[PDB]
Paper text:
In the first step of the HP, GFAT synthesizes d-glucosamine-6-phosphate (GlcN6P) from l-glutamine (l-Gln) and Frc6P, releasing l-glutamate (l-Glu). GFAT contains two domains: the glutaminase domain responsible for releasing ammonia in the hydrolysis of l-Gln to l-Glu and the isomerase/transferase domain, which catalyzes both the isomerization of Frc6P to d-glucose-6-phosphate (Glc6P) as well as the transfer of ammonia to Glc6P to produce GlcN6P. The main distinctive feature between prokaryotic and eukaryotic GFAT is the feedback inhibition by the HP product UDP-GlcNAc, which inhibits the glutaminase function.
Positioned in an evolutionary conserved region of the isomerase domain, Gly451 is in close proximity to the UDP-GlcNAc-binding site, suggesting that the mutation might interfere with UDP-GlcNAc inhibition. Crystal structure analysis of GFAT-1 G451E revealed no major structural changes compared to wild type GFAT-1. Very remarkably, however, GFAT-1 G451E showed a drastically reduced sensitivity to UDP-GlcNAc feedback inhibition.
Author numbering:
A (entry chain B): 2 to 227, 241 to 293, 304 to 681
B (entry chain A): 2 to 227, 239 to 294, 301 to 681
């Protein structure tokens, strides 16, 4: 899900300009949830904007942001020309994992039929049933089946039982969150507090961007405990200021790169255009606007596939020195020596990030000589896996917020393990709570299906392995071989992308099929699992990865002349065994597409359809052999008429159960 | 593929009775798969059986043993009433690897046009090319495209170039196997050594059954090296000569005649000369042991297939697995196979389970309870990948090797890899004297009885129970775990009756098979204790039904696979009453919200799930770490009934192996 709110303080904006900013903020967050959306703003058609802050209008609609954009427009009652010197608008795109994605269930949620209080919520309230029963007894009636509604009905209850006539907006939200359980990121708007916004979080990201032509009072907001001009953030000599609440930085970068990352239990509040935090820093983001733009590509997934030559270079920038063959990961400098004294590596992740661990398990075993265990986070938790003080636990997470991965992190910390975060989001929970970590530095990934995050994770884990063995005389040549591979890897990726058209032809031969089996072993077990997940996710074909050595133990019975098969046969030590699997498939009359080496003339001669990828070091080849499957999934999805960026039934980053 | 030979020594039999015995032997071996078969026996219709040993008749045929039995009872020249006081007959079923299925390529293979030597062979001679060229350069002409023929020709070369007039049959075979490379089980017969048999093996099972009404000379055969062959050296009936020997590659062909067997080992050369059995190599000996196997265990009975029998007899196989090991009187567990090792095992620091296919799934199904009760790290490895990666193994690892057959190559090579690293090795097997049970430090025979069906059914659930039993041993000194152990053992006590309860819903499973009859895919979703159930049920439905079933960890749905859900994709979800119940319900809501309409395997008493879902398979509640046995059985049956609806033969293996070398 995604949160966005726009607060213009003495920066006159028309209602049209305001609603455009909200929609434009949701579009930036749409990849976080696109089942439904809604906006909340001040209604009324009084030329004087001050007589309109007592009327809150809600426009919510099932579907993607484009459906809400059309609903906001061609509205007969709303006059879009009214100028607002001060105004607060809140918006929200929803990933509806439960129930119907109906307007009633979209946010903002309201406290009554006159919208005295509205709220937008990311997360889950683990005790909304108790609150609902309590609030129902006190006379409040509910209209939706969302846990968020109990938050709106509760901030009104706290207001209906306030001791003084001027209890601050912060005081009410404080009494609310004290009764809530679980995780939440909230933005409140009320008619009783016109133009005032309150943002708070507990286990869900929430940041505040600020723009103003004038100097700002400070760059380090002080926290308060239960509000003068040396305490709040505001413009000095004038009032003009613009604030931006958001659950993701992609919605704010276009307006400003000055954001305040809230923390758990921080209750931010904008009163009289002044931002104070109750109960710290003011940072400069390094993201650029072009990083979250399609550019000349028709989709984000295709851009992020084709930019992998550059993102791989960015992952290694400042860390790999090819002149002297040295590897330094700054984030591990104060911990690498103690990691070498540990006795086991555990890699914990979900989905494609788990596949990145499968893809590097072998070279990690080889270069560290430690046991390496790779776990799916959800199952890791279900089993209460044994963990010890001399374990090193890696947590692979592009977003750094995946719930199961984060819970795994806290589980391992409670048992005293050394924790390492491999993330692509600097201010994420996983990067904060780990003892040390590496930022894979791939740039923002907007496509729901991970592409560059996978290859950048792959590379990051290889660089770690290279550090772990840098004191072994016997492994110096192996390190050189690998680092030369990394130097040549970007150009070889380019060589693979130049086969786009050849892979598109193959896609036209498969797009009508129901299933496809993808087979590999060794270094390319991960390749066949990840290709199968990509094809599942964006084409909806029933693709399944099968370990090639396991064919003879049952699954080969599926194969006949009608079952599509893709096989990966590379030039490594498993080549002869892969040739046996291919022979078994052909004996069953399978007509497989084979991803093989350009020089593998024997395979190329005897197979009709081959994808000929260039050769690299065996422990880097998985990067090259997975990219044809990224592209095949892309082209299969287009032929079948689906949107590669917005696959059905899900969104990007699983931050809740 | 299947070897059987029958030697009656001063036990008179007619040619008819001898041939009936050979054919019956081959019938016990058909279940392994084959494309042809043949027999070898003495020809000639001389009323005196002694004048017929110089003539060897072969009857081979591409096709089934029934066709061979028809060929045998159709020879106008063979008089079946001749009585042999001494005779050796050999029989073979072939799964072709070198040469197309045909009469000439069938076994027995012969050394010349007069059948001076004949041999039957399980395996592959990897250097048959060099041997065929050498023999052809010495004037020996080949008629088949099989590697086996080089063995028959080679033994005649050793005979033609023998130094003394009385070089033993064993000496000739010793020199043959010195030149062979690869895997083989072999039985030889020759007109030059009438009534004598020689068997030998390298990397392929071979055993000898024995029966006599007279006392046998020993129950432990000493080994000889090239040590004379006298009455203190070999096995024989003491005061009289009468004795019968049964060579076989599988005890299933011996057990209806005798349960006294000698299992051979690599490079043993076993010979029957003058009715006496000796074993040569190039003090140690080979035991005559009693098999706890009965013919009824390898017969269908009143079931229409072995798959149905072995599924429906799981109440009895689970009981058999626990016999002598779980005391339900004082609630203790004792695995005798681990007596001299359990204390060393308890000092190790990690458990590794290594296996293939469904045996790997049994590791996945018991991983959590092993972690809980041992408190050690438990790693579950697919054997082939384990080998590809050169996985780190250490002297204080305990490595488990799960294998119904005890011969699976990758599992067996994983075993040898771990032994080289000094790990303590444990075999969980269902086959007496298999390679994995022999080469591990200690082991447990799951004692499910022989598995004749193509797919693992009872072997899986018996492996499950054996691993739970081991877990219970590992924590028997822990005060804090005594209530948990008692709960589990009470669950084991009730498990047979709860399996019967699941089986009594067979009609409900058939209705589900009707619904999925026309479907091409089905996703099977679960987590925790029932992750393995998803993987294992999906494998059975692939292997037996030939439809695209896939197991999917429920916690992974929102990470991609949920995109497959719509109103057309069939889904089976497992929702049991354990600690992941709420998370499983969450998965169900996620699927239903995207128009999925899953069938749910759930607890018998789970009222909420049953009312809010159309079709539910309701199984009885058990302890959480045993529920996987009950939740997988409906999927075994679903695989079975779907295959029957679609007209498939559940006892016919499909993939089997790969193509045949034509060269
Ligand atoms: O195409 C697949 C997705 O990329 C998905 O499987 C993702 O890998 C997981 O949801 C983990 O998310 P994080 O990488 O943010 O932890
Ligand atoms: O039903 C499937 C088969 O049983 C297959 O998965 C595999 O070949 C065995 O499970 C492993 O063989 P062993 O258990 O004999 O090692
Ligand atoms: N390789 C031999 C024997 C195969 C088997 O074990 O049946 C052949 O093809 O004749």
């Amino acid at each position: 899900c995604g949160i966005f709110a726009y607060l213009n303080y003495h920066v006159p904006r028309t209602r049209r300009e305001i609603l455009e900013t909200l929609i434009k903020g949701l579009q930036r967050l749409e990849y976080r949830g696109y089942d439904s959306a809604g906006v909340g703003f001040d209604g009324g058609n009084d030329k004087d904007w001050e007589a309109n802050a007592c009327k809150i209008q809600l426009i919510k609609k099932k579907g993607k942001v484009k459906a809400l954009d059309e609903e906001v427009h061609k509205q007969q009652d709303m006059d879009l020309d009214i100028e607002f010197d001060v105004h607060l608008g809140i918006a929200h795109t929803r990933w509806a994992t439960h129930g119907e994605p109906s307007p009633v269930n979209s946010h903002p949620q309201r406290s009554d039929k006159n919208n005295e209080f509205i709220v937008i919520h990311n997360g889950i309230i683990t005790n909304y049933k108790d609150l609902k029963k309590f609030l129902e007894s006190k006379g409040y009636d509910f209209e939706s089946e969302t846990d968020t509604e109990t938050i709106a009905k509760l901030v009104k209850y706290m207001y209906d039982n306030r001791e003084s006539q001027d209890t601050s907006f912060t005081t009410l939200v404080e009494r609310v969150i004290q009764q809530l359980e679980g995780a939440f990121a909230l933005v409140f708007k009320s008619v009783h507090f016109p133009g005032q916004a309150v943002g708070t979080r507990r286990g869900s990201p929430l940041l505040i961007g600020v723009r103003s032509e004038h100097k700002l009072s400070t760059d380090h907001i002080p926290i308060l405990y239960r509000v003068d001009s040396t305490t709040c953030l505001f413009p000095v000599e004038e009032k003009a200021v613009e604030y931006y609440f958001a659950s993701d930085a992609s919605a704010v970068i276009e307006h400003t790169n000055r954001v305040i990352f809230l923390e758990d239990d921080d209750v931010a509040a904008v009163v009289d255009g002044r931002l104070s935090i109750h109960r710290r820093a003011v940072q400069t983001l390094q993201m650029e606007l072009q990083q979250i733009m399609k550019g000349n590509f028709s989709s984000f997934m295709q851009k992020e596939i084709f930019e992998q030559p550059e993102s791989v270079v960015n992952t290694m920038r400042g860390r790999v020195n090819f002149d002297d063959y040295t590897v330094n990961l700054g984030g591990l400098k104060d911990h690498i020596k103690e990691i070498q004294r540990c006795r086991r590596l555990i890699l914990i992740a979900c989905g494609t990030s788990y596949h990145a661990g499968v893809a590097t398990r072998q070279v990690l075993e080889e270069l560290t000589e430690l046991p390496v265990m790779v776990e799916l986070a959800s199952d890791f938790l279900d089993r209460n896996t044994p963990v010890f003080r001399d374990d090193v636990c890696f947590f692979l997470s592009q977003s750094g917020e995946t719930a199961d991965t984060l819970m795994g992190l806290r589980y391992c910390k409670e048992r005293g393990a050394l924790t390492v975060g491999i993330t692509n989001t600097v201010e994420s929970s996983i990067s904060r709570e780990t003892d040390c970590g590496v930022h894979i530095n791939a740039g923002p990934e907007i496509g729901v299906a991970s592409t560059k995050a996978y290859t950048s994770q792959f590379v990051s884990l290889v660089m770690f392995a290279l550090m772990m063995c840098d004191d072994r005389i016997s492994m110096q040549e192996r390190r050189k071989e690998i680092m030369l591979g990394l130097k040549r890897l970007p150009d070889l990726i380019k060589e693979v992308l130049s086969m786009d058209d050849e892979i598109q032809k193959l896609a036209t031969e498969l797009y009508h099929q129901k299933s496809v089996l993808i087979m590999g072993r060794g270094y390319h077990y991960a390749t066949c699992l990840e290709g199968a997940l990509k094809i599942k996710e964006i084409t909806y074909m029933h693709s399944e990865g099968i370990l090639a050595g396991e064919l003879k133990h049952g699954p080969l019975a599926l194969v006949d002349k009608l079952m599509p098969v893709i096989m990966i046969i590379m030039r490594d030590h498993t080549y002869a065994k892969c040739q046996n699997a291919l022979q078994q498939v052909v004996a069953r009359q399978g007509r497989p597409v084979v991803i093989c080496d350009k020089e593998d003339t024997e395979t190329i001669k005897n197979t009709k359809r081959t994808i000929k990828v260039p050769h690299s070091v065996d422990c880097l080849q998985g990067i090259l052999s997975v990219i044809p499957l990224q592209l095949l999934a892309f082209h299969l999805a287009v032929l079948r008429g689906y949107d590669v960026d917005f696959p059905r039934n899900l969104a990007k980053s699983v931050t809740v159960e």
